[PDB]
Structures are given as C-alpha cells and as structure tokens.
Amino acid sequence: VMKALILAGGSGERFWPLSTPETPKQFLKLFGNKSLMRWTFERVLEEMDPKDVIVVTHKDYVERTKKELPELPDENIIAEPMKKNTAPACFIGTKLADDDEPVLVLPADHRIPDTKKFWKTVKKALDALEKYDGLFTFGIVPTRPETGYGYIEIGEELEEGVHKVAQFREKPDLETAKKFVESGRFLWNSGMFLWKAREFIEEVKVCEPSIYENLKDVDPRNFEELKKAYEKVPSISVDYAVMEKSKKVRVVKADFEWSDLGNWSSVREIEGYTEESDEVILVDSDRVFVKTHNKPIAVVGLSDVIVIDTPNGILICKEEYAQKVREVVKKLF
Amino acid sequence: VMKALILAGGSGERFWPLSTPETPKQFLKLFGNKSLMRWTFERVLEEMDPKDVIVVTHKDYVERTKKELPELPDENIIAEPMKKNTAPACFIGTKLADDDEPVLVLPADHRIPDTKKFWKTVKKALDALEKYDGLFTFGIVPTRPETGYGYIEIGEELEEGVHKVAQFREKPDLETAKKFVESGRFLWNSGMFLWKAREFIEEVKVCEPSIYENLKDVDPRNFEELKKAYEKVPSISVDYAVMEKSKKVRVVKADFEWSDLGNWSSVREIEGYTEESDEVILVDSDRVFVKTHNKPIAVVGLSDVIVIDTPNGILICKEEYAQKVREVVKKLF
Ligand SMILES: Nc1nc2c(ncn2[C@@H]2O[C@H](COP(=O)(O)OP(=O)(O)OP(=O)(O)O)[C@@H](O)[C@H]2O)c(=O)[nH]1
Ligand SMILES: Nc1nc2c(ncn2[C@@H]2O[C@H](COP(=O)(O)OP(=O)(O)OP(=O)(O)O)[C@@H](O)[C@H]2O)c(=O)[nH]1
Ligand SMILES: [Mg+2]
Numbered sequence A, B: 001v002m003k004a005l006i007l008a009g010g011s012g013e014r015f016w017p018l019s020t021p022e023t024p025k026q027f028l029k030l031f032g033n034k035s036l037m038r039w040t041f042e043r044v045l046e047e048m049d050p051k052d053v054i055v056v057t058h059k060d061y062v063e064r065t066k067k068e069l070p071e072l073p074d075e076n077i078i079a080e081p082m083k084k085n086t087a088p089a090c091f092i093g094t095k096l097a098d099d100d101e102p103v104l105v106l107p108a109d110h111r112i113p114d115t116k117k118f119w120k121t122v123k124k125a126l127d128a129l130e131k132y133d134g135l136f137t138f139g140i141v142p143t144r145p146e147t148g149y150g151y152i153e154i155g156e157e158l159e160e161g162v163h164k165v166a167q168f169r170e171k172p173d174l175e176t177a178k179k180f181v182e183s184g185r186f187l188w189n190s191g192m193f194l195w196k197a198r199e200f201i202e203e204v205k206v207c208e209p210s211i212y213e214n215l216k217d218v219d220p221r222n223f224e225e226l227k228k229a230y231e232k233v234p235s236i237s238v239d240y241a242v243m244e245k246s247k248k249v250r251v252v253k254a255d256f257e258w259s260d261l262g263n264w265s266s267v268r269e270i271e272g273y274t275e276e277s278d279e280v281i282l283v284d285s286d287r288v289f290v291k292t293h294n295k296p297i298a299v300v301g302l303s304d305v306i307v308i309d310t311p312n313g314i315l316i317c318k319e320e321y322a323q324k325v326r327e328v329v330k331k332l333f
C-alpha cells in the first residue's frame, strides 16, 4: 500500500509570540481558515485513506491532534516522551508500516497551493524508489536566493528529474545563497522524504546507531518504553543524522510553488510587506512586516523589520535575524 | 517684584504614545512621582509666592492644570485658543507684568535636580539684568556634543560668566557639534529666559510685529479677543521669532545639571540603555531603550532603537530619528 507520516512533534519556537509551547505553530490558522496541520492532512487525504496516515507528535499535543484531524484514527497518533528533532521522529513512524511499504515523510508546516502538482511529484518519487531504491528527498526549484533554506546539489542523473545527491548543503550566508541559485543545479531542501521502511531503518543503524540500537526493539505505542529509550537517543535532525552521511540519497525535482513556515520571513514573502494604514504608521521606514492587535504600531527610521504584537508579547526583529527567534523562546521559557 | 512665566501649552507630540492630545507630556511623570509641570512649579515655589507665577496653557488643559497646581490662583492660568508655539505665549504672559518687572520664562519640561544651584544662578542673572539690561538666556555647559540642541556663541564678555550673545546657532552635525564643544566658547540653549517686561515687548515690536500689533492691546484673559488675535498671529517659537534676530541678547552660564525632555532619547539619556530582564529579551541587540506594558518585549538584531509600549500604541524608533515622532502624531491624529 502506501503510508503517510505527518511530523507534528516540534515546538515552533521561531514563531513566538504567536506560537507558544501551549499553542505551537502547527495549530495556528496562518493561512486560509485552517491550521497548518489540517492543510497537510487534507492534501494527503486527496489520494489516501485516513487509515494510511500516521502522525508523530509530542504527548502534549495528542488531544489537540484528535480535534484538528477527526477523521484520523486514535491509534494513528503517536505520542513521544521528548522531542529530539526529525531524525528519531522518522524512526518510530517507519516501524509501523510494512517492511517493503513506501512511507512518505511530511512536515506539517509546508504550504503547497497546487495539490495535484504535488501528487504528480509524489507519484514520480514512488516509481523512482521502486526503480533505484535509496532515500528520496524532494528538492524545490528555487525562485529566489532565500537564506534559511538547506540546499541539495545534483549528482549524476539517473532518469529525467531524478538525480543522486551530489552534495547536501545547509545555512547559506546571503552571498552563499546567491552562489547556490546561479549554478542552475542547487535545489532547496524541502524537508519531505520518501523511503521504504526497511531500507531507512537499515541506513539509520549504519549512519546513526545512537538512534537505531535504542529504538530497534521498542514498540512505538508503548509510551513508557519510548520514554525510557528516548532518554538515550540523540537530538539531531534527519538531514544531519542521515541524509548527509548516507551514500544512497537521491533528489527528485519538485517543480511547484512551495514554502516552509520556518521563520517570520516566510509569512512576509507570502502576503508581502505590510502597507501603511490607520493601524500601521510608517515614517522613513521601508519593507516592514507588521502584525497588529487592536492598537496601532508606528515604525520610524527602520527598514526590513518584522513587528508582531500579541497578548504573549511583542517581537521586534530585523529580517536577516529571524532565525534567531529561538533564543527569545529559550530565554523566555 | 519678579514674575515667573511657565510655558505649558504645547502638545508633547514627540512623546507618542505616552503623550496624547488628551494627556500631553507636561502631565506625565517621566521622572519621580510628579509630572513635568508639578516639578517645574515646586522648583519655582521655593523662593516665590504663587501669586507671582503665571502658567500659559492651551484652553483644554486649564482644568487639568488646576488639579496639578491647587496653590496657583485660577486667574494666574492664562488660557490659549490654539498653539502658536512659545513666542506668542511669551508675549501674552509678559504683558501681564509691569514694564520694569523682570519676568523669568520657564519651560515646563526640564529636569533640574539642584534647585538651590538653579536659584543661585537666577539671582546672578537678576543682578546682570539691572547692570546691563537686554534679554537674558541661560546657557548650559555642554557635557557631550548634542545633535538636538541650539547653541549660544559667546560674544563680548560683560562680566565673568556673562556675555553678549555673539550668535544663536542650531542643530549641529556630530562633526559641527564636536567643533562647538571642543572650542569651549559655545553653551547649550536651555530655552530659559529672563527679561524686564517693557523691554521684551519692545523687541517683539522690532522682531515680530506680526505678533506685536495683534496682541498689543489684547487682554490675555479675554478669551474671544485673544481668539481673534491668535487667528492673525504666526506660529513660531520665541527662539526663531525674537532671540535670533535681536541685538541685545545676553547669556548666563548654567553649570547645574540640566536636561530637556524633548524626545524619547532624553528619557534614555536619564534612565540609561535598558538591560535584559524578565520582560525585555535582547538577542544581538545593543544600546536599546524599551518601555514595557506588562507583557514581554523581545528585540532581535537591532541596535540603537527605542521601543515604547502603551494602551495607546506601540512606537519602534531608530534613535537618530526620535524627532520624527511628530509625524506619527500628525498621521494618526
Ligand atoms: N516527532 C517530532 N517532530 C518534530 C520534531 N522537531 C520538529 N518536528 C516536526 O517536523 C516539522 C519540522 O518543523 P520545523 O520547521 O523545524 O519547526 P519546529 O521544529 O516545530 O519549530 P522550530 O524548529 O523550533 O522553529 C514540523 O511539522 C514539526 O512539528 C521532533 O523533535 N519530534
Ligand atoms: N502656552 C504655550 N506653551 C507652549 C506652546 N508650545 C510649546 N509650549 C511649551 O513650552 C515648552 C516647549 O517645550 P517643547 O519641547 O516645544 O514641547 P512641546 O512643544 O509641548 O512638544 P513637541 O510638540 O514635541 O515640540 C513646553 O513646556 C511646552 O508645553 C504653545 O503654543 N503655547
Ligand atoms: Mg526545528
């Protein structure tokens, strides 16, 4: 068959003060009248049954999860004891499928307007997997040189639009992101993945036993076991843990509009710089993304800043620095 | 006998959002648990009887002034129809004195902690007033090269510390201010004045007839005459109007600590730059001023900015632009 793994187990620290530990980004209606998570399940449901859809989560957001995705079975929600980033998150999820069953790993913080373009891309990814095995990533074609994107360099072509990962890069300085685009053959690391359960779990033991050995004989739905094991599991991402080191990483071309709700800069790029109005007063200040809350905000003498007013607090952030909003959360919480 | 003329009819537009047209800066408690106006009044009352003190205001602030200043007779509050800046309020205030009455003109928004030393200086001015006549001012020894002040180029010395004003200057470049302070022959222009009532009026007649003729026979307390009188009178400070033009401005040295509460930087200059606490979260942000309102403020990647949060609005201001807060009030109101 096929199984979709929805990763909804992070904090969404970079979206303070809208996102909190009590209410992470996954449940916010940033776009449309639907949450980030809801949009992801709907896109998935287009072609798949709910029975086939699995959500790896922190124990706290279980009840939240049941609300947003009522059609999801109670059993298909997995509750983690601790968050240790996307690497372990993938391991517990992949064990639930059949050994040879293809598992589509999806972040819940992606905005992909064209769901059919999406599914064509997942179909092609499905056939590539059958044809070459390995671990697939979905590389978005850059439309700009955005910092705060991981990148994928293209290796030897296998078939049209499917290549080996020549080089897996991260964290571009402003010029280093201009370098990337120029080339013609650097794609944005989407954060989506496709693999067959068995091959993936096999590469984890090779690449990251720290992960494997403590989770190989652990049942995912045993909370008290998962707890006991996660105490020895490292907090590393899928990418640093596996997708860099592994010698069978492939990349498929995702030729569609795609955005990652990573940091506040991403929301700006969607709806654009805020224009002056009764509630947002501007004086010698260009390229501002303000978000108001029943009282006006004036920015004077500042350009390329994010301003977000909330009952949780106010963020005032230079756009370049948007990735550091973690620090705020870390200190505050 | 000597009279005091307190200018408290302005809007405090550069203190938005703390200062509003309903509650301007003169009624705010920027330092200590008293308002600017109250401090100004208590300073005066040390050596002076309330009957000898006059406060010039806008009409809307009349009831509020009474509450702040219960010792001041109702009749010693002169009510204005509309703002014409200080030069007009200086005229209708001074007219109330006798011709040979030395009037001491005081902004309601200075911080001068050492009242003993202030008064010492006004006595030295008073004696200078008898020997030399002319208009006096009070020039503060510049402690740093301020961009925000006008300076008093010392002319001929009449007597130690007391000089003919050679010239009145304005907002220097960091460079040009650096020249004035390095030379030792330039004092900051406090905005304080001392003059005999007849002589001042005589100067307005010579430097600003516009004002003179329209208010020469007006009764200041007659609201409607004044109203018709102000319809015909230019909005202009006493500095541009009279002091810059006239040929008998003298200046006395103020060695005391003095500060003008002219914009938000002035507050920072007193309180100092704000440090991290439970409510001010700083992340790669230096030299910052933050006024919280019972919810956390995080500043990320911005140096030299003012952030003020209130029920009325939020200001985010690059320091060097602090003067432009007027333009916020203009748009918003
Ligand atoms: N199960 C699990 N999921 C995670 C973990 N970390 C992130 N995720 C999920 O994987 C996706 C990638 O999330 P990110 O873009 O990194 O956002 P985030 O991790 O929630 O929040 P920050 O990275 O702190 O800003 C999101 O849908 C998360 O919910 C984790 O440690 N465990
Ligand atoms: N009576 C009267 N007083 C004034 C007028 N304009 C300013 N003042 C006062 O004289 C002093 C001058 O201080 P300013 O720095 O100009 O303060 P402000 O004009 O109230 O506030 P800004 O609009 O920011 O300039 C303050 O005490 C003012 O209240 C006026 O038109 N009439
Ligand atoms: Mg993360």
Ligand SMILES: [Mg+2]
Binding pocket: B010
């Ligand atoms: Mg003014």
